[PDB]
Amino acid sequence: FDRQKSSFQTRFNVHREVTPVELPNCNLVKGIDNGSEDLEILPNGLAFISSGGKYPGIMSFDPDKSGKILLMDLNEKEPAVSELEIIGNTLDISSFNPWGISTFIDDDNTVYLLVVNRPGSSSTVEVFKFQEEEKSLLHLKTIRHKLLPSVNDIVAVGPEHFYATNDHYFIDPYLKSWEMHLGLAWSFVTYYSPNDVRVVAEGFDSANGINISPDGKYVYIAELLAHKIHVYEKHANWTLTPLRVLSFDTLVDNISVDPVTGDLWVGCHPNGMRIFFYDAENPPGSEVLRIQDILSEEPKVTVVYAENGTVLQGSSVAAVYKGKLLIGTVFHKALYCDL
Ligand SMILES: [Br-]
Ligand SMILES: [Ca+2]
Ligand SMILES: [Ca+2]
Numbered sequence: 001f002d003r004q005k006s007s008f009q010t011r012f013n014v015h016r017e018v019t020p021v022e023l024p025n026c027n028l029v030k031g032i033d034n035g036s037e038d039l040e041i042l043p044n045g046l047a048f049i050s051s052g053g054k055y056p057g058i059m060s061f062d063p064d065k066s067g068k069i070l071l072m073d074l075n076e077k078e079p080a081v082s083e084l085e086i087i088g089n090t091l092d093i094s095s096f097n098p099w100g101i102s103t104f105i106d107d108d109n110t111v112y113l114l115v116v117n118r119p120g121s122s123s124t125v126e127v128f129k130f131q132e133e134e135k136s137l138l139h140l141k142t143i144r145h146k147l148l149p150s151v152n153d154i155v156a157v158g159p160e161h162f163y164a165t166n167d168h169y170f171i172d173p174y175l176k177s178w179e180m181h182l183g184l185a186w187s188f189v190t191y192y193s194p195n196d197v198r199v200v201a202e203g204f205d206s207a208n209g210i211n212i213s214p215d216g217k218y219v220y221i222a223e224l225l226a227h228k229i230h231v232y233e234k235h236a237n238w239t240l241t242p243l244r245v246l247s248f249d250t251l252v253d254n255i256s257v258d259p260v261t262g263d264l265w266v267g268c269h270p271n272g273m274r275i276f277f278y279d280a281e282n283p284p285g286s287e288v289l290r291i292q293d294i295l296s297e298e299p300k301v302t303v304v305y306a307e308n309g310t311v312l313q314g315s316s317v318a319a320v321y322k323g324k325l326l327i328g329t330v331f332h333k334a335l336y337c338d339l
Pocket of ligand 3: 152208209253254316
Protein backbone atom coordinates (compact mmCIF):
# COMPACT_ATOMS: atom_id res chain seq x y z
CA PHE A 1 0.00 0.00 0.00
CA ASP A 2 2.96 2.31 0.59
CA ARG A 3 3.64 2.17 -3.16
CA GLN A 4 0.01 3.19 -3.76
CA LYS A 5 0.17 6.40 -1.72
CA SER A 6 3.43 7.21 -3.51
CA SER A 7 1.84 6.79 -6.95
CA PHE A 8 -1.04 9.05 -5.93
CA GLN A 9 1.30 11.79 -4.68
CA THR A 10 3.23 11.69 -7.96
CA ARG A 11 0.20 11.60 -10.28
CA PHE A 12 -1.53 14.46 -8.47
CA ASN A 13 1.75 16.41 -7.99
CA VAL A 14 0.69 17.06 -4.42
CA HIS A 15 3.85 18.95 -3.38
CA ARG A 16 4.11 21.28 -6.38
CA GLU A 17 4.06 25.03 -5.78
CA VAL A 18 4.08 27.75 -8.40
CA THR A 19 7.01 30.09 -8.95
CA PRO A 20 5.39 33.22 -10.44
CA VAL A 21 5.96 34.10 -14.08
CA GLU A 22 4.22 37.43 -14.52
CA LEU A 23 2.88 39.38 -17.47
CA PRO A 24 2.39 43.12 -16.88
CA ASN A 25 -0.85 43.67 -18.86
CA CYS A 26 -3.32 40.85 -18.16
CA ASN A 27 -7.06 41.52 -17.93
CA LEU A 28 -9.86 39.17 -16.88
CA VAL A 29 -12.48 38.68 -19.60
CA LYS A 30 -15.74 40.21 -18.37
CA GLY A 31 -18.63 37.77 -18.50
CA ILE A 32 -16.61 34.58 -17.92
CA ASP A 33 -17.00 33.33 -14.36
CA ASN A 34 -18.01 29.67 -14.52
CA GLY A 35 -15.40 28.04 -16.70
CA SER A 36 -13.75 28.47 -20.10
CA GLU A 37 -12.08 25.13 -20.21
CA ASP A 38 -11.38 24.87 -23.95
CA LEU A 39 -11.03 27.42 -26.71
CA GLU A 40 -9.88 27.69 -30.31
CA ILE A 41 -8.87 30.70 -32.41
CA LEU A 42 -9.54 30.77 -36.15
CA PRO A 43 -6.92 32.24 -38.52
CA ASN A 44 -9.05 35.42 -38.72
CA GLY A 45 -8.88 36.04 -34.95
CA LEU A 46 -12.35 34.84 -34.01
CA ALA A 47 -12.10 32.74 -30.83
CA PHE A 48 -14.63 30.11 -29.77
CA ILE A 49 -14.81 29.42 -26.03
CA SER A 50 -16.45 26.42 -24.38
CA SER A 51 -17.93 27.78 -21.13
CA GLY A 52 -20.10 26.57 -18.27
CA GLY A 53 -19.51 22.85 -18.67
CA LYS A 54 -20.14 20.59 -15.69
CA TYR A 55 -18.18 17.40 -15.16
CA PRO A 56 -18.68 14.60 -12.61
CA GLY A 57 -16.87 15.69 -9.45
CA ILE A 58 -15.51 19.01 -10.77
CA MET A 59 -16.05 22.19 -8.75
CA SER A 60 -18.72 24.56 -10.02
CA PHE A 61 -19.38 28.06 -8.68
CA ASP A 62 -22.99 28.26 -10.00
CA PRO A 63 -24.49 24.74 -9.94
CA ASP A 64 -27.43 25.91 -12.10
CA LYS A 65 -25.07 27.41 -14.73
CA SER A 66 -25.87 26.60 -18.35
CA GLY A 67 -23.27 25.56 -20.91
CA LYS A 68 -22.51 28.07 -23.65
CA ILE A 69 -20.23 28.53 -26.63
CA LEU A 70 -18.86 32.09 -26.58
CA LEU A 71 -17.33 34.17 -29.36
CA MET A 72 -14.55 36.78 -29.03
CA ASP A 73 -13.11 38.85 -31.87
CA LEU A 74 -9.46 39.16 -30.88
CA ASN A 75 -8.91 41.83 -33.54
CA GLU A 76 -10.81 44.21 -31.23
CA LYS A 77 -8.88 46.41 -28.81
CA GLU A 78 -10.78 45.23 -25.71
CA PRO A 79 -12.64 42.18 -27.08
CA ALA A 80 -15.92 41.33 -25.37
CA VAL A 81 -17.64 37.94 -25.36
CA SER A 82 -20.99 37.16 -26.90
CA GLU A 83 -23.00 33.99 -26.42
CA LEU A 84 -23.52 32.10 -29.68
CA GLU A 85 -27.12 31.12 -30.32
CA ILE A 86 -27.65 27.44 -31.07
CA ILE A 87 -30.30 26.99 -33.75
CA GLY A 88 -31.79 23.87 -35.27
CA ASN A 89 -34.15 21.08 -34.30
CA THR A 90 -31.80 18.09 -33.99
CA LEU A 91 -30.31 18.84 -30.54
CA ASP A 92 -31.71 18.76 -27.00
CA ILE A 93 -30.43 22.13 -25.77
CA SER A 94 -31.59 21.64 -22.18
CA SER A 95 -28.91 19.00 -21.57
CA PHE A 96 -26.16 20.77 -23.59
CA ASN A 97 -23.02 20.42 -21.45
CA PRO A 98 -19.97 21.38 -23.53
CA TRP A 99 -16.37 20.38 -22.85
CA GLY A 100 -13.56 20.17 -25.46
CA ILE A 101 -14.02 21.77 -28.89
CA SER A 102 -12.35 21.79 -32.30
CA THR A 103 -12.89 23.59 -35.61
CA PHE A 104 -12.66 22.48 -39.21
CA ILE A 105 -12.65 24.85 -42.19
CA ASP A 106 -13.79 23.30 -45.49
CA ASP A 107 -12.61 24.18 -49.02
CA ASP A 108 -15.64 26.47 -49.48
CA ASN A 109 -14.48 28.12 -46.23
CA THR A 110 -17.40 26.72 -44.23
CA VAL A 111 -16.46 26.65 -40.54
CA TYR A 112 -17.51 23.58 -38.56
CA LEU A 113 -17.41 23.55 -34.76
CA LEU A 114 -17.21 20.14 -33.09
CA VAL A 115 -18.18 20.14 -29.40
CA VAL A 116 -17.74 17.37 -26.86
CA ASN A 117 -21.07 17.10 -25.06
CA ARG A 118 -21.62 15.34 -21.71
CA PRO A 119 -25.42 15.36 -21.31
CA GLY A 120 -26.10 13.45 -18.11
CA SER A 121 -24.09 10.22 -18.07
CA SER A 122 -23.60 9.92 -21.83
CA SER A 123 -20.94 11.33 -24.13
CA THR A 124 -21.48 12.72 -27.63
CA VAL A 125 -19.74 14.93 -30.16
CA GLU A 126 -22.02 17.65 -31.57
CA VAL A 127 -21.32 19.03 -35.05
CA PHE A 128 -22.29 22.64 -35.76
CA LYS A 129 -21.97 24.97 -38.73
CA PHE A 130 -20.78 28.45 -37.72
CA GLN A 131 -22.86 31.31 -39.19
CA GLU A 132 -20.65 34.35 -38.69
CA GLU A 133 -23.03 37.17 -39.63
CA GLU A 134 -25.84 35.78 -37.46
CA LYS A 135 -23.46 34.81 -34.60
CA SER A 136 -25.12 31.44 -34.40
CA LEU A 137 -24.28 27.75 -34.45
CA LEU A 138 -26.47 25.62 -36.71
CA HIS A 139 -26.59 22.13 -35.23
CA LEU A 140 -26.01 19.42 -37.81
CA LYS A 141 -25.41 16.08 -36.14
CA THR A 142 -24.99 14.23 -32.84
CA ILE A 143 -22.21 11.63 -32.93
CA ARG A 144 -22.18 8.72 -30.49
CA HIS A 145 -20.28 5.46 -30.60
CA LYS A 146 -19.24 2.58 -28.37
CA LEU A 147 -15.62 3.67 -28.87
CA LEU A 148 -16.54 7.16 -27.53
CA PRO A 149 -17.67 6.33 -23.96
CA SER A 150 -16.07 9.25 -22.13
CA VAL A 151 -14.93 11.91 -24.59
CA ASN A 152 -12.80 14.76 -23.25
CA ASP A 153 -11.50 16.60 -26.31
CA ILE A 154 -11.33 16.08 -30.07
CA VAL A 155 -9.26 17.42 -32.93
CA ALA A 156 -11.28 17.66 -36.15
CA VAL A 157 -9.80 16.52 -39.45
CA GLY A 158 -13.06 16.92 -41.39
CA PRO A 159 -16.68 17.98 -40.85
CA GLU A 160 -17.46 14.75 -38.96
CA HIS A 161 -13.97 13.27 -38.76
CA PHE A 162 -11.84 13.60 -35.64
CA TYR A 163 -9.53 12.02 -33.12
CA ALA A 164 -11.08 11.90 -29.65
CA THR A 165 -9.55 11.33 -26.23
CA ASN A 166 -11.56 9.23 -23.81
CA ASP A 167 -10.31 10.31 -20.39
CA HIS A 168 -11.77 7.15 -18.78
CA TYR A 169 -12.55 3.65 -19.94
CA PHE A 170 -15.75 3.42 -17.88
CA ILE A 171 -18.96 5.41 -18.32
CA ASP A 172 -20.39 5.23 -14.79
CA PRO A 173 -19.02 8.14 -12.71
CA TYR A 174 -18.51 5.94 -9.64
CA LEU A 175 -16.49 3.39 -11.63
CA LYS A 176 -14.80 6.40 -13.28
CA SER A 177 -13.71 7.82 -9.91
CA TRP A 178 -12.49 4.36 -8.89
CA GLU A 179 -10.56 3.79 -12.13
CA MET A 180 -8.91 7.21 -11.72
CA HIS A 181 -7.98 6.61 -8.08
CA LEU A 182 -6.62 3.15 -8.86
CA GLY A 183 -4.58 4.54 -11.77
CA LEU A 184 -5.61 1.72 -14.13
CA ALA A 185 -4.55 3.90 -17.11
CA TRP A 186 -7.20 2.55 -19.46
CA SER A 187 -7.90 5.89 -21.21
CA PHE A 188 -7.65 5.68 -25.01
CA VAL A 189 -7.82 7.64 -28.26
CA THR A 190 -10.36 6.95 -31.01
CA TYR A 191 -10.32 7.94 -34.68
CA TYR A 192 -13.93 8.59 -35.79
CA SER A 193 -15.15 8.97 -39.38
CA PRO A 194 -18.46 8.06 -41.04
CA ASN A 195 -17.11 4.86 -42.61
CA ASP A 196 -14.38 3.86 -40.15
CA VAL A 197 -14.14 4.12 -36.34
CA ARG A 198 -11.20 2.56 -34.51
CA VAL A 199 -8.98 2.91 -31.45
CA VAL A 200 -5.60 4.35 -32.48
CA ALA A 201 -3.74 4.48 -29.13
CA GLU A 202 -4.47 3.25 -25.62
CA GLY A 203 -3.13 2.81 -22.11
CA PHE A 204 -3.23 6.47 -21.02
CA ASP A 205 -3.40 7.78 -17.45
CA SER A 206 -6.23 10.20 -18.35
CA ALA A 207 -5.84 11.44 -21.94
CA ASN A 208 -7.14 15.03 -22.04
CA GLY A 209 -6.00 17.53 -24.67
CA ILE A 210 -5.38 16.45 -28.24
CA ASN A 211 -4.29 18.39 -31.31
CA ILE A 212 -2.47 18.12 -34.63
CA SER A 213 0.48 19.73 -36.41
CA PRO A 214 -0.43 22.28 -39.10
CA ASP A 215 0.73 19.90 -41.83
CA GLY A 216 -1.34 17.03 -40.35
CA LYS A 217 1.69 14.75 -39.94
CA TYR A 218 1.72 14.59 -36.11
CA VAL A 219 -0.89 14.18 -33.39
CA TYR A 220 -0.25 15.46 -29.86
CA ILE A 221 -1.92 13.89 -26.83
CA ALA A 222 -1.84 15.23 -23.27
CA GLU A 223 -1.66 12.47 -20.64
CA LEU A 224 -2.84 14.55 -17.70
CA LEU A 225 -1.99 12.39 -14.67
CA ALA A 226 1.30 11.10 -16.11
CA HIS A 227 2.34 14.75 -16.83
CA LYS A 228 3.26 13.82 -20.39
CA ILE A 229 2.61 14.98 -23.93
CA HIS A 230 2.85 12.19 -26.49
CA VAL A 231 3.88 12.88 -30.09
CA TYR A 232 2.47 10.42 -32.62
CA GLU A 233 3.21 10.06 -36.30
CA LYS A 234 -0.10 10.34 -38.17
CA HIS A 235 -0.31 8.22 -41.33
CA ALA A 236 -2.30 8.55 -44.52
CA ASN A 237 -4.66 5.80 -43.32
CA TRP A 238 -5.26 7.74 -40.03
CA THR A 239 -3.38 5.29 -37.79
CA LEU A 240 -0.87 6.64 -35.29
CA THR A 241 2.63 5.47 -34.42
CA PRO A 242 4.45 6.64 -31.28
CA LEU A 243 7.36 8.98 -31.93
CA ARG A 244 8.26 10.99 -28.82
CA VAL A 245 7.14 11.48 -25.22
CA LEU A 246 7.81 14.73 -23.35
CA SER A 247 7.60 14.75 -19.55
CA PHE A 248 6.74 17.70 -17.30
CA ASP A 249 6.42 18.70 -13.63
CA THR A 250 2.80 19.75 -14.13
CA LEU A 251 -0.55 18.26 -15.16
CA VAL A 252 -0.84 19.08 -18.86
CA ASP A 253 -4.49 19.69 -19.80
CA ASN A 254 -5.50 21.07 -23.23
CA ILE A 255 -3.08 21.56 -26.14
CA SER A 256 -3.31 24.43 -28.61
CA VAL A 257 -1.18 24.56 -31.77
CA ASP A 258 0.05 27.79 -33.36
CA PRO A 259 -0.54 27.39 -37.13
CA VAL A 260 2.41 29.58 -38.19
CA THR A 261 5.15 27.98 -36.07
CA GLY A 262 3.63 24.65 -35.11
CA ASP A 263 4.40 25.50 -31.46
CA LEU A 264 2.32 23.88 -28.73
CA TRP A 265 0.65 26.14 -26.16
CA VAL A 266 -0.51 24.14 -23.13
CA GLY A 267 -2.75 24.98 -20.21
CA CYS A 268 -1.49 23.23 -17.08
CA HIS A 269 -2.45 22.47 -13.47
CA PRO A 270 0.71 22.60 -11.34
CA ASN A 271 -0.85 20.81 -8.34
CA GLY A 272 -3.41 18.09 -9.04
CA MET A 273 -4.90 18.19 -5.53
CA ARG A 274 -5.94 21.81 -5.95
CA ILE A 275 -7.75 21.27 -9.25
CA PHE A 276 -9.46 17.96 -8.37
CA PHE A 277 -10.33 18.61 -4.68
CA TYR A 278 -11.38 22.24 -4.60
CA ASP A 279 -10.72 24.34 -1.49
CA ALA A 280 -11.60 28.04 -1.72
CA GLU A 281 -8.82 28.69 0.81
CA ASN A 282 -6.30 26.76 -1.34
CA PRO A 283 -7.44 27.38 -4.93
CA PRO A 284 -5.77 25.94 -8.04
CA GLY A 285 -3.18 28.11 -9.73
CA SER A 286 -2.44 28.58 -13.42
CA GLU A 287 0.48 27.73 -15.69
CA VAL A 288 0.97 28.14 -19.46
CA LEU A 289 3.74 26.36 -21.38
CA ARG A 290 5.05 27.09 -24.87
CA ILE A 291 6.77 24.12 -26.55
CA GLN A 292 8.97 24.74 -29.60
CA ASP A 293 10.73 22.33 -31.98
CA ILE A 294 8.98 19.36 -30.42
CA LEU A 295 10.67 16.81 -32.70
CA SER A 296 14.26 17.91 -32.04
CA GLU A 297 16.59 16.41 -29.45
CA GLU A 298 16.03 19.15 -26.84
CA PRO A 299 12.58 20.73 -27.30
CA LYS A 300 12.37 24.27 -25.92
CA VAL A 301 9.80 24.43 -23.10
CA THR A 302 9.04 27.89 -21.70
CA VAL A 303 6.76 28.84 -18.83
CA VAL A 304 5.04 31.88 -20.32
CA TYR A 305 2.66 32.56 -17.43
CA ALA A 306 2.32 31.12 -13.92
CA GLU A 307 0.57 32.16 -10.69
CA ASN A 308 -0.95 30.66 -7.57
CA GLY A 309 -4.55 31.56 -8.38
CA THR A 310 -4.88 34.99 -6.79
CA VAL A 311 -6.07 36.13 -10.26
CA LEU A 312 -6.82 33.09 -12.50
CA GLN A 313 -7.66 29.67 -11.02
CA GLY A 314 -7.31 26.38 -12.86
CA SER A 315 -5.85 27.28 -16.27
CA SER A 316 -6.79 24.50 -18.70
CA VAL A 317 -6.09 25.99 -22.16
CA ALA A 318 -4.09 28.82 -23.67
CA ALA A 319 -3.62 30.11 -27.20
CA VAL A 320 -1.94 33.08 -28.87
CA TYR A 321 -3.02 35.55 -31.54
CA LYS A 322 -0.92 38.44 -32.95
CA GLY A 323 0.94 39.09 -29.71
CA LYS A 324 -1.91 38.32 -27.28
CA LEU A 325 -2.41 35.33 -24.97
CA LEU A 326 -5.88 34.00 -24.10
CA ILE A 327 -6.08 31.62 -21.12
CA GLY A 328 -9.14 29.59 -20.15
CA THR A 329 -9.90 27.66 -16.93
CA VAL A 330 -11.85 24.57 -16.08
CA PHE A 331 -14.43 26.29 -13.83
CA HIS A 332 -13.30 29.89 -13.21
CA LYS A 333 -12.51 32.97 -15.27
CA ALA A 334 -10.48 33.76 -18.41
CA LEU A 335 -7.43 36.00 -18.83
CA TYR A 336 -6.35 38.03 -21.87
CA CYS A 337 -2.73 39.19 -21.82
CA ASP A 338 -0.06 40.96 -23.75
CA LEU A 339 2.80 38.54 -24.29
BR1 LIG B 1 -1.56 24.99 -8.28
CA1 LIG C 1 -9.85 21.16 -28.20
CA1 LIG D 1 -9.31 18.48 -18.95
